[PDB]
From Swiss-Prot, chain A:
Protein's UniProt name: Renin receptor cytoplasmic fragment
Cytoplasmic side: 24-43
Superkingdom field: Eukaryota
Gene that encodes the chain: Atp6ap2
Parts of the chain that traverse the membrane: 3-23
Curated annotation (Swiss-Prot), chains B, H, I, J, K, L:
Cytoplasmic side: 29-50, 110-126
Residues annotated as transmembrane: 6-28, 51-71, 88-109, 127-147
Protein name per UniProt: V-type proton ATPase 16 kDa proteolipid subunit c
Source organism of the structure: Rattus norvegicus (Rat)
Subunit structure: V-ATPase is a heteromultimeric enzyme made up of two complexes: the ATP-hydrolytic V1 complex and the proton translocation V0 complex. The V1 complex consists of three catalytic AB heterodimers that form a heterohexamer, three peripheral stalks each consisting of EG heterodimers, one central rotor including subunits D and F, and the regulatory subunits C and H. The proton translocation complex V0 consists of the proton transport subunit a, a ring of proteolipid subunits c9c'', rotary subunit d, subunits e and f, and the accessory subunits ATP6AP1/Ac45 and ATP6AP2/PRR.
From Swiss-Prot, chain C:
UniProt organism field: Rattus norvegicus
Ranges that cross the membrane: 1-21
Protein name: V-type proton ATPase subunit S1
Localisation: Endoplasmic reticulum membrane; Endoplasmic reticulum-Golgi intermediate compartment membrane; Cytoplasmic vesicle, Secretory vesicle, Synaptic vesicle membrane; Cytoplasmic vesicle, Clathrin-coated vesicle membrane
Family: Belongs to the vacuolar ATPase subunit S1 family.
Expression (tissue specificity): Expressed in brain (at protein level).
Portion held of the full protein: 413 to 452 of 463
Domain of life: Eukaryota
Summary of the function given for this chain in its UniProt record: Accessory subunit of the proton-transporting vacuolar (V)-ATPase protein pump, which is required for luminal acidification of secretory vesicles. Guides the V-type ATPase into specialized subcellular compartments, such as neuroendocrine regulated secretory vesicles or the ruffled border of the osteoclast, thereby regulating its activity. Involved in membrane trafficking and Ca(2+)-dependent membrane fusion. May play a role in the assembly of the V-type ATPase complex.
Cytoplasmic side: 22-40
Post-translational modification remark: N-glycosylated.
UniProtKB/Swiss-Prot annotation, chain F:
Entry annotated with the keyword Transmembrane helix: yes
Recorded family membership: Belongs to the V-ATPase 116 kDa subunit family.
Transmembrane regions: 23-52, 117-136, 155-175
Protein name in UniProt: V-type proton ATPase 116 kDa subunit a 1
Membrane-side (Cytoplasmic) residue stretches: 8-22, 137-154
Origin superkingdom: Eukaryota
Function: Subunit of the V0 complex of vacuolar(H+)-ATPase (V-ATPase), a multisubunit enzyme composed of a peripheral complex (V1) that hydrolyzes ATP and a membrane integral complex (V0) that translocates protons. V-ATPase is responsible for the acidification of various organelles, such as lysosomes, endosomes, the trans-Golgi network, and secretory granules, including synaptic vesicles. In certain cell types, can be exported to the plasma membrane, where it is involved in the acidification of the extracellular environment. Required for assembly and activity of the vacuolar ATPase.
Keyword Phosphoprotein: yes
Organism: Rattus norvegicus
């Protein structure tokens, strides 16, 4: 009973939180070190 | 009388408090580390001063650790749901606020350390800016504690 | 049931205003400053 | 596509209006005729003052010479470019950087050779082309050490990526300076072309035709000029850009060619080019192939100004105004040397 | 064949280690006829504890066979290093 | 390590362009000890390639007495089940003389019995070692005649660490010797009391005190 | 392209889930669990009506406002060398304000029809109220989107007009004809929105 | 009797017709206007010839108007639902078909004007193409009318 | 005897057929016109031959018009649903297949028109390929005709 | 008799009115400040005049504040839903309208400030175009206010 | 006892067989034609013997046509559902498999024709490779033929 | 009589206020810090004046702390839901408005600080512009305070 | 040889995963009261996603650290310190998982 309440809450809460992790992970995954200073020589 | 599934919210809180704040500290440390490497090769004499952004980043992760434990030690099977919701909100408040702080710490650390390599007078200003980012993390901790004990 | 008239109507209005927020934020994020200043 | 004509004007709206406003100031055919009817350098100045040009030779030496007006013309367009380059955002600024790269490449060729033949950087910088600039140090005060210049370039100079073809310094000492600069420029064209295709909207369609022309035009001229010198056919082929219409099949024929006739036979497969070789009568008192290429390039750069939502207008602007400078200097030079029958060798820019 | 003394030397070490392990293992199976407790017993297991002892005896025999091969391997690898 | 030492004269008086071999050679005396201690600890862990070493002293339980304790023909159902061996049946008990009783190496719950040991052991060893590291600081502060570094430094620092973390260590040993299976139900959880300790959390019920 | 990748991933997952749920509800022969009539009738006509009203005005402003900046930047840029431009090319922005007005008038005419129902059980209650609700939504959406795209059209064209006039003052008058067609696009949306709500009643 | 909500689909039809046709006309017009202004700077004598693409785009708008009006006038409360579906289909049919036509009109008009600016002999060619795009739009109207009166 | 909303699937067929085929022809026309406008500058004498890809594209549009009308004429209120699904399938089959054909027409025309100007002997090859694209569209029509009468 | 959740839609109206308007004004300010910073270096005498785009951006924020408060003061517990959706509409109406106006002010202001420094005769034209942008935001307010009592 | 949701699965099979196969053939045709046009500049004598990649593309379209007809002829009202899922599988199997083949035909055709232009020895190789892609498409037909009669 | 799970919305409000405000202040801080490091390396004498952007960012964070606490102290178990929606509105209103203010602070801070070193007369204009951004953050607080006690 | 440290330390994350994954598995039965199941889920996610964050941190700093060290061997000490803090993040994940999974 009241399934629609638990369902609605859990669906969107975990979806938003999961996406926040995905986006944060993306931003960290592709962190730009600058590709300078010593990178030009090591490359 | 207790709605089953109620614990799900509080449990996600305890995890979220650590996971999101960990990503923040991870960004802060990783972003600062690159800036440190650039400075140190140019001049290693500052290697023991440019580490500070990293220590600060760690403190953010601790903020999250503290709440995550407080929530976990506040879980029960016969949970009244109200408290479970507060725990979720408290965990997210510190986790996501620390996450924002982590980005703030990393960006300014890299810029500050790279600048300091050229201008030693930049150090003091860098620290003050880093202080604001640590304060941004603390505000999250304060609210999370208020909610989790409410 | 999975959804109620209340829940659904809420989601329907939420998405419209969420799209507005997304639009606004999109243009805000795609906002740059200058690399250098023109002259002395 | 729907890619432009929407977000484009958010940041680049001002610059589009400004640069086309600047284009409006280029000498027209009616204006060139008024400049020809001078026969005196001071009168040339007076007639120039009728346009957006003028009042820039004031406070200079009372006698006007060709070298003075030449330098001043460059400076005028450099300021206009730098202005537009400074009031710009990354989406567009990166495009402009490529334009500046072409001049940086020439300037670093100047920095080497001089470094290889002990000359100080401070003596070399005054004769570097504007827009090179090199605000970064380490390229300065290299102590006439090739290694220091090659380290400063690899690290600080934006051209570092391009030098991946020519590396280890050994290349700098063993390769002829001209092979080095032609190789580096080819790398530039390849990256710049791909950049334009990443901007896969109006810019790609309006800009790429110009770059594709440059690639093929250089391939033609390089093949011809290389006939009388000592250069391995394979090393010559290494200098042909692959962003053009000769790349699929055609460059192979130029690489093998040992005569102008064979080069024309290659052009024969491309009516757009064949017309240039047939128009380039190359008689002892006529226009040559380089002259027809300039006329074609201007046609292309002018057609760029038929699209109102792209970056190709800024590239075309620079090239058209650079040719404008060549035209004006040509007139000033023809006046000074009194060769009035050769005055009508300027490239009309409409 | 020479095969390289670096690889023959490795064979000597593997052979010596193997002979030591295989002999000791076979003994353990024979004595505790056990910790390993993996002799591949039957599923149709009857009330005959002696059936388990017999299984371990088979496992032990197999262990000494493997040791014999390592003894032969060590002999060959040994002479290779001496000749190399 | 022994091989490297026995060939020390031949390896040292030679060229060794491979820095990986040179590195481990230079540490050959460090490795020697690591091996010797690895044997000692492995025997106490009672793991030799995932095999235990039964010295005929494994007296954890007397299976004959298991069947006496209301387990008649359990091997019939056993075909599909495990059945956990009870504590304090009156016929089991007695520590293993040295290391972990071999019997656990063949259990399906090794992963809880021995896992708990290693967790608690790691805490015990870490905290004690840390306290040693702090104790050393006292001698240095004495050598340099810095009374302030001991009156306001060492003393409150060692007390701080002792009061929080040494207390924990004591309780760990206490539980092992204080509670038997007779009190396994509602047996105190050391981790929960540790957290409640710091927070001054003292519920009326739900957790028994040590 | 971080944001474009986000938008795509959401788009694909959004519809992919709808496909799976739709086909599953069919396959497993659910008792018409996916009931479109349920959705349409439970959703209060007040939501549909007031949404259309806000969209009608708000989307029209978005268009107007969009076009304003399109021509604003072009006019200001060109004006650096041709100050004459501001005399004539301001009408492009007059056209954009007119595009916004279209929506404003329509939004008010629609909102004037808003009434309470004092209704409860949708069954056989407010049949006409639902028609008026949906019609108001449609008419509001119709004019809103029509003005939205109209505003963009006139903006883009006005940019070309300013760039043309900057170089030749004789071109403005001839080009002006195109913007007039653009404005007509918005007016057509108004005509239909009026018809859609020409026969509605609430209450 | 006539079911509730049945008008919902018919209303979407009338809206879809006008909105998608407006999209087509708006795009086609904007593209033509850009090309016209671009040409007119270079040579003004062709300006009148370059206007037709804009009218083409306007016709797309009318196509949508004809159906949107037809449906909007037909809409009532007591709709038998079947009629609403025909209206929905007719609305989409003309709108989306006119949308496709408007896109085509834009692309070919813009390219055609630049082409004609370079080569006056192209005039007839681009007009023939634009006629095909107008025919593409009409097809949309034809189907929509057939459904709307069915 | 028949279910409600059964016409919903059918009417979408009539709409889908016209819209997708119009979208295909619209794309093919737009790409072909772009090539024609660019090519015709150098070779104006080819203007009356380079139009062919555009005609091809128009055929895709008719293909779609024919089925859309047939569905509309055979779409009734008391439809047995079975027939409705068949009409939807027929509509999609010709529409989406015509869309694919329009793409091919587009790419082949664009490249072919320019290739022909640079190579008069390509004209026949261009036609042959475009014949294949028309055949691809026809296959869709054939299936739709089979389904709509099944 | 009050459909539960009736209050939810209303309060979101007050939120939207303020949040969307703040976003618009914030963007408008950001663009104007960037243009001012770039311009002011060479011509500092124009700093005072150049502030105007920023003030208007601020006005956009005020319109949102006016509605957001008007709605907030109009909320009760026993909301009849009818009133709630009216408040939501008013909130969204001013929100998106103010948001769009803020973009126009920012983008135009940026160009205007840069252009004015190059050509002061453009100053009045800058102001005129920007007034229109504000008038658009006003429009949003006017209708949002009218709806609040219907 | 026949479930009324079965005539949909079935007809979607016939549609999928044709639509996806046309998409594949259209892609292969578009890419092959582009390569041919470029090739013709230098080697016009190869134009006729370069059409083969396009013919093969067409064969992929036929694979789909045949299955679509076989299903369409098999469609009835009283379908036992089992048959409907076999029709759906057979449709997708041949269609999507042909789609994959279309990409292989297209990419190999483009690269092959462009290479052949310079290295006439590549021609046998181009054909062998393209034969494999046609075989991959046939595999789809084989499974569809097995399923449609099961 | 009070609906269950009614506290959820108010709890999300308290957390949203803090998190979004921290995000805003974090962005503004990071962008200013980058400009400060890039600017003050040449002109360290400005290092103590360029910090202000960062302080204002911190104020955005406080706005969030004040509301987040105000909301948390207003929550109970038996919440009438109405109050919760009000709390959610107040939370989001200040949070998202502060977020917008954060971008305004960040963009203007970076541009202003670097510009100020190039032209010291810009300092006052920078502060005035940043003042509008702080006011934008405050407007959010004003509404949140009105709603949170309504 | 020295440059391997980032890789060796990174391996701890996989170990932490094993430690918790097994600790949870040891407590999986059929008659679970749900409550304990959520706790296990949270502990699993906590250490996993925290280890993921730590993995990012270690990798990014390792690349810069190893390259920098060759340019300046004095970087060794700074590299070690940075790596430690990144590893601590993985440790914090374990700590929460241990407390939660045993509650």
């Amino acid at each position: 009973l009241e399934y629609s309440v638990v369902f609605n809450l859990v669906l969107w809460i975990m979806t938003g939180l999961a996406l926040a992790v995905i986006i944060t992970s993306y931003n960290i995954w592709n962190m730009d070190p600058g590709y300078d200073s010593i990178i030009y020589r090591m490359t | 009388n207790n709605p089953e599934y109620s614990s799900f919210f509080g449990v996600m809180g305890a995890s979220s408090a650590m996971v999101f704040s960990a990503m923040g500290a991870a960004y802060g440390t990783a972003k600062s580390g690159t800036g440190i490497a650039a400075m140190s090769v140019m001049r290693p004499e500052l290697i023991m001063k440019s580490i500070i952004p990293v220590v600060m980043a760690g403190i953010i992760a601790i903020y999250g650790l503290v709440v995550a434990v407080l929530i976990a030690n506040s879980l029960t099977d016969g949970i009244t749901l109200y408290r479970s919701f507060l725990q979720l909100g408290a965990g997210l408040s510190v986790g996501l606020s620390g996450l924002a702080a982590g980005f703030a710490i990393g960006i300014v650390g890299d810029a500050g350390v790279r600048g300091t390599a050229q201008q030693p007078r930049l150090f003091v200003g860098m620290i003050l800016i880093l202080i604001f980012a640590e304060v941004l993390g603390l505000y999250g901790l304060i609210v999370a504690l208020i909610l989790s004990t409410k | 049931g999975f959804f109620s008239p209340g829940i659904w109507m809420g989601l329907l209005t939420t998405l419209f205003m969420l799209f507005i927020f997304t639009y606004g934020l999109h243009m805000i994020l795609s906002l740059k400053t200058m690399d250098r200043f023109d002259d002395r | 596509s729907f890619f432009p004509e929407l977000y484009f004007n958010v940041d680049n709206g001002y610059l589009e209006g400004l640069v086309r406003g600047l284009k409006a100031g280029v000498l027209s055919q009616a204006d060139y005729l008024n400049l020809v009817q001078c026969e005196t350098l001071e009168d040339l100045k007076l007639h120039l003052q009728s346009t957006d040009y003028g009042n820039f030779l004031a406070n200079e030496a009372s006698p006007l010479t060709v070298s003075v007006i030449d330098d001043k013309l460059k400076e005028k367009m450099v300021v206009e470019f730098r202005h537009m380059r400074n009031h710009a955002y990354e989406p567009l600024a990166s495009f402009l950087d490529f334009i500046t790269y072409s001049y940086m490449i020439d300037n670093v060729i100047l920095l080497i050779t001089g470094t290889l033949h002990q000359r100080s950087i401070a003596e070399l910088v005054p004769k570097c082309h504007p827009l090179g600039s090199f605000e970064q140090m380490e390229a300065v005060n290299i102590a006439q050490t090739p290694a220091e210049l090659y380290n400063a370039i690899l690290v600080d100079t934006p051209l570092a990526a391009f030098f991946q073809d020519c590396i280890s310094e050994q290349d700098l000492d063993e390769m002829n300076i001209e092979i080095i600069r032609n190789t580096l420029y080819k790398a530039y064209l390849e990256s710049f072309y791909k950049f334009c295709t990443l901007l896969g909207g109006t810019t790609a369609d309006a800009m790429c035709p110009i770059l594709e022309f440059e690639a093929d035009r250089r391939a033609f001229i390089i093949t011809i000029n290389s006939f009388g010198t000592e250069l391995s056919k394979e090393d010559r082929a290494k200098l042909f850009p692959h962003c053009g219409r000769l790349y699929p099949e055609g460059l192979a024929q130029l690489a093998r060619a040992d005569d102008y006739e064979q080069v024309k036979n290659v052009a024969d497969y491309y009516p757009e080019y064949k017309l240039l070789f047939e128009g380039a009568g190359s008689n002892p008192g006529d226009k040559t192939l380089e002259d027809r290429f300039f006329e074609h390039e201007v046609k292309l750069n002018k057609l760029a100004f038929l699209n109102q939502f792209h970056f190709g207008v800024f590239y075309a602007f620079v090239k058209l105004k650079e040719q404008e400078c060549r035209n004006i200097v040509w007139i000033a030079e023809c006046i000074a040397q009194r060769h009035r029958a050769k005055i009508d060798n300027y490239i009309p820019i409409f | 064949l020479c095969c390289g003394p670096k690889l023959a030397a490795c064979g000597i070490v593997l052979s010596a280690w193997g002979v030591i392990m295989l002999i000791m293992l076979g003994i353990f199976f024979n004595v505790h006829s056990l910790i390993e407790d993996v002799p591949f017993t039957e599923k149709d297991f009857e009330n005959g504890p002696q059936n388990i002892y017999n299984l371990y005896e088979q496992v032990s025999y197999n262990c000494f066979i493997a040791a014999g091969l390592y003894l032969l391997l060590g002999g060959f690898s040994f002479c290779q290093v001496r000749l190399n | 390590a022994v091989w490297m030492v026995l060939r020390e004269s031949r390896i040292l008086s030679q060229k060794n362009e491979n820095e990986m071999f040179s590195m481990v050679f230079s540490g050959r005396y460090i490795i020697l000890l690591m091996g010797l201690f690895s044997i000692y600890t492995g025997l106490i862990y009672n793991d030799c390639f995932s095999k235990s070493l039964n010295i005929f002293g494994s007296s954890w339980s007397v299976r004959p007495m298991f069947t006496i304790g209301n387990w008649t023909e359990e091997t019939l159902l056993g075909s599909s089940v495990l059945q956990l061996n009870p504590a304090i049946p009156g016929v089991f008990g007695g520590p293993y003389p040295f290391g972990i009783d071999p019997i656990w190496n063949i259990a399906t719950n090794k992963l809880t019995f021995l896992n708990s040991f290693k967790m608690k052991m790691s805490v015990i060893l870490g905290i004690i070692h840390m306290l040693f590291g702090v104790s050393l600081s006292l001698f240095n502060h004495i050598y340099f005649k810095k009374p302030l570094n001991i009156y306001f430094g060492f003393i409150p620092e060692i007390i701080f660490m002792s009061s929080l973390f040494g207390y924990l260590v004591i309780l760990i040993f206490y539980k092992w010797t204080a509670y038997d299976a007779h009190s396994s139900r509602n047996a105190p959880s050391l981790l929960i009391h540790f957290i409640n300790m710091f927070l001054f959390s003292y519920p009326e019920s739900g957790n028994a005190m040590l | 392209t971080g944001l474009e990748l986000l938008y795509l991933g959401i788009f694909v997952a959004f519809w992919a889930c709808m496909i799976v749920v739709g086909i599953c509800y069919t396959i497993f022969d659910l008792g018409f669990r996916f009931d479109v009539a349920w959705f349409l009738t439970e959703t209060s006509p007040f939501m549909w009506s007031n949404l259309g009203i806000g969209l009608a005005i708000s989307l029209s402003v978005v268009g107007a406002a969009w076009g304003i900046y399109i021509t604003g930047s072009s006019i200001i840029g060109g004006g650096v060398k041709a100050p004459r431009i501001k005399t004539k090319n301001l009408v492009s922005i007059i056209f954009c304000e007119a595009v916004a007005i279209y929506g404003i008038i329509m939004a008010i005419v629609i909102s004037n029809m808003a009434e309470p129902f004092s209704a409860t059980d949708p069954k056989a209650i407010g049949h006409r109220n639902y028609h008026a609700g949906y019609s108001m939504f449609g008419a509001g959406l119709t004019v809103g989107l029509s003005n939205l795209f109209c505003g963009v059209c006139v903006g883009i064209v006005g940019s070309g007009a300013a760039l043309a006039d900057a170089q030749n003052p004789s071109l403005f008058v001839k080009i002006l004809i195109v913007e007039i067609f653009g404005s007509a696009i918005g007016l057509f949306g108004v005509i239909v929105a009026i018809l859609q709500t020409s026969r509605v009643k609430m209450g």
